[PDB]
Amino acid sequence: RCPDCGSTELVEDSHYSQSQLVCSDCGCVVTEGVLTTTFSDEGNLREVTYSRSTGENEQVSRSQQRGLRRVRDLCRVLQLPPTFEDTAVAYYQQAYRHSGIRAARLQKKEVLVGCCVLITCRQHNWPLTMGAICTLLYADLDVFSSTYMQIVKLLGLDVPSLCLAELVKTYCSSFKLFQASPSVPAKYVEDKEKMLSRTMQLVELANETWLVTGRHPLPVITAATFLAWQSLQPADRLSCSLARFCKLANVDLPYPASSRLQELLAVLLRMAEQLAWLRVLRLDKRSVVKHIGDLLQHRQSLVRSAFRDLLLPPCMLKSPKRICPVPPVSTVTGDENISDSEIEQYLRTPQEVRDFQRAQA
Amino acid sequence: RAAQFDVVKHMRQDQITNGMVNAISTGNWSLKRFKMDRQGVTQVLSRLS
Amino acid sequence: ESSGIVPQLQNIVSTVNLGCKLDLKTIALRARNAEYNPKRFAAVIMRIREPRTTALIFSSGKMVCTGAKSEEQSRLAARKYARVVQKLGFPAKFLDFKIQNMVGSCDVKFPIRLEGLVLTHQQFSSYEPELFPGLIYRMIKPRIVLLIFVSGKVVLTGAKVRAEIYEAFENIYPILKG
Amino acid sequence: VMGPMLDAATRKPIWRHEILDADGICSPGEKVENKQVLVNKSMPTVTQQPQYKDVPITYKGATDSYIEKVMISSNAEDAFLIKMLLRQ
Amino acid sequence: QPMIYICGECHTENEIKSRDPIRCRECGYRIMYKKRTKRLVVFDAR
Amino acid sequence: CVVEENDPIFERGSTTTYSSFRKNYYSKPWSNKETDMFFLAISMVGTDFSMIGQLFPHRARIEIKNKFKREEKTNGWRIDKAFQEKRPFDFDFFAHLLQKVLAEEEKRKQK
Amino acid sequence: IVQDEILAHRLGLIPIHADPRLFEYRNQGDEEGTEIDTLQFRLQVRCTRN
Amino acid sequence: INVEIKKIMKANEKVTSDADPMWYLKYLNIYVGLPDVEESFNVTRPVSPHECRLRDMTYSAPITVDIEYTRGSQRIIRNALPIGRMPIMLRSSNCVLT
Numbered sequence: 007r008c009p010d011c012g013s014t015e016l017v018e019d020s021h022y023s024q025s026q027l028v029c030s031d032c033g034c035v036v037t038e039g040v041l042t043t044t045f046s047d048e049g050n051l052r053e054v055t056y057s058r059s060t061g062e063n064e065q066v067s068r069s070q071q072r073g074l075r076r077v078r079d080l081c082r083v084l085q086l087p088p089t090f091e092d093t094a095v096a097y098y099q100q101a102y103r104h105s106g107i108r109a110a111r112l113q114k115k116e117v118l119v120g121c122c123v124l125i126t127c128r129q130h131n132w133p134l135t136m137g138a139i140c141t142l143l144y145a146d147l148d149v150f151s152s153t154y155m156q157i158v159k160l161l162g163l164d165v166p167s168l169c170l171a172e173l174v175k176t177y178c179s180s181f182k183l184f185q186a187s188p189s190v191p192a193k194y195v196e197d198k199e200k201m202l203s204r205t206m207q208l209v210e211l212a213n214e215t216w217l218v219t220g221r222h223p224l225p226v227i228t229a230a231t232f233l234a235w236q237s238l239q240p241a242d243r244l245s246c247s248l249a250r251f252c253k254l255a256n257v258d259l260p261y262p263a264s265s266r267l268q269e270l271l272a273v274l275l276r277m278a279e280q281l282a283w284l285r286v287l288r289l290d291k292r293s294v295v296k297h298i299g300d301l302l303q304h305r306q307s308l309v310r311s312a313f314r315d316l317l318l319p320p321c322m323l324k325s326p327k328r329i330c331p332v333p334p335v336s337t338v339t340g341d342e343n344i345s346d347s348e349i350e351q352y353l354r355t356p357q358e359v360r361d362f363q364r365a366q367a
Numbered sequence: 368r369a370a371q372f373d374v375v376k377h378m379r380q381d382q383i384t385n386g387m388v389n390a391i392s393t394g395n396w397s398l399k400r401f402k403m404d405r406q407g408v409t410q411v412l413s414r415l416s
Numbered sequence: 417e418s419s420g421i422v423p424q425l426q427n428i429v430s431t432v433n434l435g436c437k438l439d440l441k442t443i444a445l446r447a448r449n450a451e452y453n454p455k456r457f458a459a460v461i462m463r464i465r466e467p468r469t470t471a472l473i474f475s476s477g478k479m480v481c482t483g484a485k486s487e488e489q490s491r492l493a494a495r496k497y498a499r500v501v502q503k504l505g506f507p508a509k510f511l512d513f514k515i516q517n518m519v520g521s522c523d524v525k526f527p528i529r530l531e532g533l534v535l536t537h538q539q540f541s542s543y544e545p546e547l548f549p550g551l552i553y554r555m556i557k558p559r560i561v562l563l564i565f566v567s568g569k570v571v572l573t574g575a576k577v578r579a580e581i582y583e584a585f586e587n588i589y590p591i592l593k594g
Numbered sequence: 595v596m597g598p599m600l601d602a603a604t605r606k607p608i609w610r611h612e613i614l615d616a617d618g619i620c621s622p623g624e625k626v627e628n629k630q631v632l633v634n635k636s637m638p639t640v641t642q643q644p645q646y647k648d649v650p651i652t653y654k655g656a657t658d659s660y661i662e663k664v665m666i667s668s669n670a671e672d673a674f675l676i677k678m679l680l681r682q
Numbered sequence: 683q684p685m686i687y688i689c690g691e692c693h694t695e696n697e698i699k700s701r702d703p704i705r706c707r708e709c710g711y712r713i714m715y716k717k718r719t720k721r722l723v724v725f726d727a728r
Numbered sequence: 729c730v731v732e733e734n735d736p737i738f739e740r741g742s743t744t745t746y747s748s749f750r751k752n753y754y755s756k757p758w759s760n761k762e763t764d765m766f767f768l769a770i771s772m773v774g775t776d777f778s779m780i781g782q783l784f785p786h787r788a789r790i791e792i793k794n795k796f797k798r799e800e801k802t803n804g805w806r807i808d809k810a811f812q813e814k815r816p817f818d819f820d821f822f823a824h825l826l827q828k829v830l831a832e833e834e835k836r837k838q839k
Numbered sequence: 840i841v842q843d844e845i846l847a848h849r850l851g852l853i854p855i856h857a858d859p860r861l862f863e864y865r866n867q868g869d870e871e872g873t874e875i876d877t878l879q880f881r882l883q884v885r886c887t888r889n
Numbered sequence: 890i891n892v893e894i895k896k897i898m899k900a901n902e903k904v905t906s907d908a909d910p911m912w913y914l915k916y917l918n919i920y921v922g923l924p925d926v927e928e929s930f931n932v933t934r935p936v937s938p939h940e941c942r943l944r945d946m947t948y949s950a951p952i953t954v955d956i957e958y959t960r961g962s963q964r965i966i967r968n969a970l971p972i973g974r975m976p977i978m979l980r981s982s983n984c985v986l987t
């Protein structure tokens with residue numbers, strides 16, 4: 007309030023390079039002048055961080071220090087920004103706060119570093135498959151997933167879902183069919199932008215047709231990019247196989263990639279049957295690759311009609327007449343027991359006892 | 368551990384990048400292997416004309 | 417407006433103390449269906465015709481009976497195991513019996529968008545298709561953990577009485593339907 | 595970036611936030627006077643509800659300047675870089 | 683409120699909300715300019 | 729020094745790698761006569777897997793446990809009949825049957 | 840691409856064939872202008888491909 | 890970037906540790922590649938000097954090298970591994986302006 011009139015209309019108005027909080031009613035100067043360091047003071051002062059001024063970094067054990075150093079080393083090997091590095095170290099410290107993770111195994115803390123890196127990567131909508139992390143972390147997928155579930159259940163942090171398009175782009179950037187290298191001839195080289203757009207459309211179709219839900223996404227991405235590479239030039243790529251494409255691209259062939267490719271080809275054949283000219287052509291899983299483009303051109307109405315006339319595993323679509331048969335309720339309990347004949351037939355005889363002893367002698 | 372160790376897991380790719388960026392931005396070059404401490408090597412290109 | 421579907425309990429796990437020490441060596445020696453290996457595990461595995469029942473008897477008198485389909489069947493199996501232990505020559509008793517957990521299964525007969533479910537109930541759900549195809553939902557109502565599959569089949573666990581599983585299913589049905 | 599603080603008395607932005615657009619960023623084509631904000635930036639103070647404090651980029655100049663272009667880019671750190679080109 | 687921007691190479695009017703990845707369709711350029719205001723501005727011929 | 733003892737491998741593409749989750753288990757299926765003699769061994773011993781694995785040298789105890797669990801989950805009447813019936817433990821005849829099974833699998837491999 | 844101020848200066852440098860004897864000087868201020876002492880020239884040009 | 894870098898790589902081609910003999914890391918050939926930007930998600934994309942000036946980033950190219958080491962006495966080779974980023978000079982041999 008103003009000391010003269012008591013008004014609360016105090017505005018900060020700088021009058022010719024002079025900061026001043028003055029009232030807007032009577033113009034009474036409440037406060038004037040501010041003290042700010044100059045260039046000489048700024049250059050003479052040294053920067054000290056809270057990690058040292060507050061007092062931390064001293065009550066830390068060598069194990070936690072090694073964990074933090076490994077987190078930083080992996081974050082730098084992955085060429086992730088310092089913001090990602092900071093978020094990763096922060097999440098690692100937050101997880102270490104707990105005792106169950108504090109006093110855990112060496113592999114446990116390694117997988118903890120891995121999962122903290124993965125959570126930091128997911129929080130920024132960044133694509134990063136867990137396979138590369140498991141490979142660069144010296145761990146197995148089983149224990150990795152077990153410790154990941156344990157730590158997420160213990161913490162409860164937000165786990166954003168892995169976007170499909172980001173992973174699609176990340177995996178398409180890996181293939182070397184963009185620049186003509188000595189090994190790969192020019193016929194296999196295709197257009198990066200067009201192939202990526204085709205793969206994106208294919209994986210969106212797969213996500214909308216219930217193909218990626220419940221199954222690994224990377225095999226579907228591989229099948230989609232393979233179908234796009236074949237459709238961009240079906241003539242010279244009619245004989246090429248999935249294993250041949252993997253060998254040419256220097257990529258580890260996923261196992262269910264074949265099943266995902268077969269399912270996607272079946273969906274494309276259904277879309278062809280929906281279309282008029284294609285259903286008259288009577289194409290197949292080998293001649294639909296040249297018309298995949300026409301399918302994706304208007305896949306909306308095609309998928310709509312296909313759903314009008316759900317996608318489940320093959321083991322369930324085998325005419326499930328008796329779904330979850332009702333078992334016969336048997337609550338017969340008697341009074342308290344049945345008899346002692348069962349106890350007698352359960353008890354081991356002396357002959358069998360001696361036989362077991364002789365066998366295990 | 369019995370798990371065989373390899374360099375690819377510690378091949379820090381940001382070391383050289385940060386070193387070059389700093390040497391070109393700050394302009395101060397401190398080579399300890401040669402005991403060379405130079406300053407003012409890099410200067411802002413004057414775009415006055 | 418009920419859901420119209422009733423789950424089916426496939427496992428009932430309950431602990432029960434006998435109140436006396438036991439000699440696992442003699443228990444396994446004087447029995448035909450006895451499975452015990454002290455260097456591997458310190459529990460004797462007993463089996464009876466209550467559906468799929470397996471008792472994990474210990475030396476301290478504590479035994480966990482699992483595989484039953486109902487609380488009454490689990491109690492009957494526990495009492496039969498206690499009677500077998502008594503006939504084996506030990507002063508075993510049937511005290512401190514209480515249902516510890518019950519795992520059941522159910523089906524909704526229509527697909528479910530796991531991505532949409534997790535985007536809608538993230539704070540109560542977790543979806544990691546790269547590890548387990550089933551989305552893991554954790555409801556606080558009866559403290560229940562549910563595995564939801566794309567096919568619609570849902571497996572519930574972490575309850576104490578059949579009513580808890582029933583009301584949890586009745587509450588989660590409209591969320592999955594919507 | 596917060597929107598222009600409209601004055602309830604006149605239902606128009608105040609003299610300080612007059613040059614700001616609907617998104618709080620000054621639009622090209624207008625003139626900038628002394629002690630006028632260009633980006634109504636607000637940053638959190640925690641680093642339970644976040645508490646944002648305003649730190650707008652005020653224009654220090656004796657004469658007026660005209661905004662020619664306002665470029666907006668996004669870096670790999672999800673950081674938004676906004677560059678305004680003032681002309682005199 | 684629909685906020686419109688222009689691309690650096692495509693020069694197409696793109697509508698995006700707040701807190702979105704700065705990108706332009708049918709390309710991958712990450713330079714987005716703001717269109718000129720519609721308000722009346724007075725200039726002096728001196 | 730390594731005098732051309734190993735060969736370089738063109739693996740581990742620097743781009744990225746995926747997971748497997750299935751490494752070593754890779755069990756081997758059973759047969760009709762093998763299931764019959766397995767039910768016989770069950771009726772003869774019980775449920776103690778240690779002795780069953782000791783008497784089955786060519787099949788793992790983990791595989792035996794998996795088979796027993798599968799039988800308990802699918803065919804309960806067969807396990808009930810096996811527990812109803814009993815046979816005194818035989819060693820020489822059991823070794824003879826083991827040799828017969830070895831000869832049978834050898835003939836199968838020949839086929 | 841031409842700056843607004845440069846364009847305004849170039850336009851101000853353009854002469855007008857109007858007879859000045861028929862007009863008068865604008866008073867102090869009055870930016871709206873009056874019909875007696877103001878002339879309005881519109882310029883609207885939209886370039887497009889042929 | 891064409892001869893001196895290769896000479897330095899040849900001078901420092903082999904590096905090994907005293908402990909655990911028979912272990913080494915041999916570089917075969919180092920490459921500089923074309924100027925790229927690490928903006929995209931693990932994807933490279935050509936970037937222009939003007940775009941770099943606008944976005945306040947560095948105009949460098951990813952330094953890649955091929956190497957061979959011994960993990961468990963089994964020689965494992967890598968044909969392309971990034972190790973750094975060398976700021977590319979404008980109007981150079983590998984620059985986009987030339």
Ligand SMILES: Nc1nc2c(ncn2[C@@H]2O[C@H](COP(=O)(O)OP(=O)(O)OP(=O)(O)O)[C@@H](O)[C@H]2O)c(=O)[nH]1
Pocket residue numbers: 406407
């Ligand atoms: N107008 C002006 N020009 C300067 C100034 N300082 C340096 N220059 C110009 O650029 C040069 C030297 O800049 P430096 O003194 O090397 O900058 P610096 O001192 O290295 O910065 P520090 O490393 O912190 O000391 C001279 O050749 C000058 O032509 C300055 O303060 N004003």
Ligand SMILES: [Zn+2]
Pocket residue numbers: 008009010011012013029030031032033034
């Ligand atoms: Zn006042």
Ligand SMILES: [Zn+2]
Pocket residue numbers: 689690691692693694706707708709711
């Ligand atoms: Zn564009």
